[PDB]
Amino acid sequence: HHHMENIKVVVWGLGAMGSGIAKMILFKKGMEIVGAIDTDPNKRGKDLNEILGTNSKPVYITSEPQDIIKKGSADIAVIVTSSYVEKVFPLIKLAVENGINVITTAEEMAYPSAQHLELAKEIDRLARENGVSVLGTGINPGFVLDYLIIALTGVCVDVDSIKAARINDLSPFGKAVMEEQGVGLTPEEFEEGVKNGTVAGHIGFPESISMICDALGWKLSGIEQTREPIVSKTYRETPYARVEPGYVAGCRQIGYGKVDGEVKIELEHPQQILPQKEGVETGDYIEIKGTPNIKLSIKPEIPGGLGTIALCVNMIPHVINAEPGLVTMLDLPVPRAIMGDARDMIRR
Amino acid sequence: MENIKVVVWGLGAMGSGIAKMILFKKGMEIVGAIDTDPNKRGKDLNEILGTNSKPVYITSEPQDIIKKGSADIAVIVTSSYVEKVFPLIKLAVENGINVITTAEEMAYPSAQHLELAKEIDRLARENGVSVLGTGINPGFVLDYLIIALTGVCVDVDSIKAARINDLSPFGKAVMEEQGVGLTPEEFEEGVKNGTVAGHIGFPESISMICDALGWKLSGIEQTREPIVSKTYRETPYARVEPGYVAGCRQIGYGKVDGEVKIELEHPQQILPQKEGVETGDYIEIKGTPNIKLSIKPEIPGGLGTIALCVNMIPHVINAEPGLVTMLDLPVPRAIMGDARDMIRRR
Ligand SMILES: NC(=O)c1ccc[n+]([C@@H]2O[C@H](COP(=O)([O-])OP(=O)(O)OC[C@H]3O[C@@H](n4cnc5c(N)ncnc54)[C@H](O)[C@@H]3O)[C@@H](O)[C@H]2O)c1
């Protein structure tokens, strides 16, 4: 109890999520930053406080992970870089080999066995052999279209099917996001955009669907997805995009989880600029068909960015406290805000 | 490889709902049914459930079936009070049997019964078993689910939440419990003498939230006012002409440094739709960000509690020994596979 050291965090990746996570860790009593890593030459060497506009014991961003990812130097690394297991696995490996807990936002890491069984097995072996835990989380995947749905099923005698949607407004975002979701394209330019990879859709549905089925004990016979344009019937314009009727207002990603060849789970993530233009309200919508039926909604949707920053930080005690190994949102206690001293949440 | 063996202690609305569910759940078995009601003592549980399965005879002597090795878990669905369920919990735990119970106070027994809670935790750890109180409210929608949403919040100012049902289909017992058809005069008279029970659980819910968030409570305050109809409302068990109490509204206030941080409200009334009132579970978290969640209609209190009790059985078995709350366990989930595959060995 006496002279508990602050939870020591390395933020690894300092883009949008890295920055927000760092700001929050500072603001939280019980946690402190001991390292900041990024490959960005613009950021190399700078004091973290300058990047975020804050006053604290200065931390100097390194492009070299290994002068902070050392044995016993930090409690937990927060890896906010790539979407893909194969691109954060080398970072995860380095962190756990030095006995450092890991939280990552990588969508594929929300349930890595869904698409990377052998790599997920290796993360678990490495985390166990080193006595630390690895968690992938986020708002989606990681919370609203998996963990939250799963929790609701806990009040059901029986679940027939699950249909859920998450709807946002792309209008605050810049050109890079517009191009990821095909805003402004023609339907035909959308198809080649998807087929060549400029249209990103949404990453994480195989992870979310697999997590649900494992949780409920369904055995998947297949996972299908579609990534199709949201063809506008109206005029919509923001500083970074202009869609006229017949042009693509955004991208609708759909995930189908199949049991015995039948759809038990359908997840939808339509992303577009200004859905108010055609009466589409933002929000997270969950419907459970079974005994009983359950219809939940959060309007507007839980903020993708703010929520992922908050959830990442809030899960730090749980990943530290968790038994060693790779963990998912199916293994940890309930998420919760840290309105007290984070040191009190550590199991000693 | 072997079925999860369950004893159901108490066979009322919840007990028989839970037994019927366990019967039809793969990997789960009822090995015993306890109830002191003479109209139930001695009967085949199937006679009560209306089911057609292997006979299980209801005993009123707990010692007949609560003994070392006879069950993995007892499900206690009798009283709302720690005082009244503690002897049952004690018997089951002293025989190495995990416990789940629906008793509202047991959702967070430290709130109002810290010393009893400490002893439950001690007996359970001494006997290598776990104890959990749960339910829809308290136990899920106005505590666990609220807490879960704050986990996406950078910072929480306050929490306000209401759960609204319709007492219409329930009957004379429940009507009198909620003061339906009374007078605002008899209502408070009913509250004082205890004939109007309102809702048990807000201290447990409010305390669970604070402990979860790291808030330190200055105190809990509760009101239990009536709901005066402006309308004629008639069910086969009540008649409420305008001016008379259509139901009871419970409100709980969690105060931190004297300021109100949590307000929970549970208006139970017949036919809320005869005025404008929509049923549902309503949660609003004021902070960064703000979150407004709505479950329409509300999670059915009876059916959801039956389901949640059964679904939590493997998590309580798998939990490490001692008293646990919904703050300690993995996420609730429906059991659509074989419950035996969920049992983890240490
Ligand atoms: N709900 C969710 O699951 C969720 C939510 C938000 C973000 N994400 C994912 O998290 C990741 C981070 O998102 P973001 O908004 O911070 O993106 P971003 O592009 O703003 O951040 C990327 C940063 O990481 C750095 N980086 C990249 N590779 C690196 C490496 N090998 N070593 C060190 N630094 C490296 C880059 O230089 C950049 O500064 C993205 O892949 C995103 O898809 C998931």
Ligand SMILES: NC(=O)c1ccc[n+]([C@@H]2O[C@H](COP(=O)([O-])OP(=O)(O)OC[C@H]3O[C@@H](n4cnc5c(N)ncnc54)[C@H](O)[C@@H]3O)[C@@H](O)[C@H]2O)c1
């Ligand atoms: N959300 C929640 O947390 C939640 C929801 C529903 C019910 N509950 C609680 O669970 C309890 C069960 O509710 P219910 O509707 O089934 O009540 P009920 O009155 O319908 O059934 C109670 C049964 O238990 C039996 N019983 C009582 N004391 C006993 C003893 N010492 N030994 C053996 N049998 C005994 C009675 O004979 C009766 O059949 C209630 O106290 C209720 O408040 C909680």
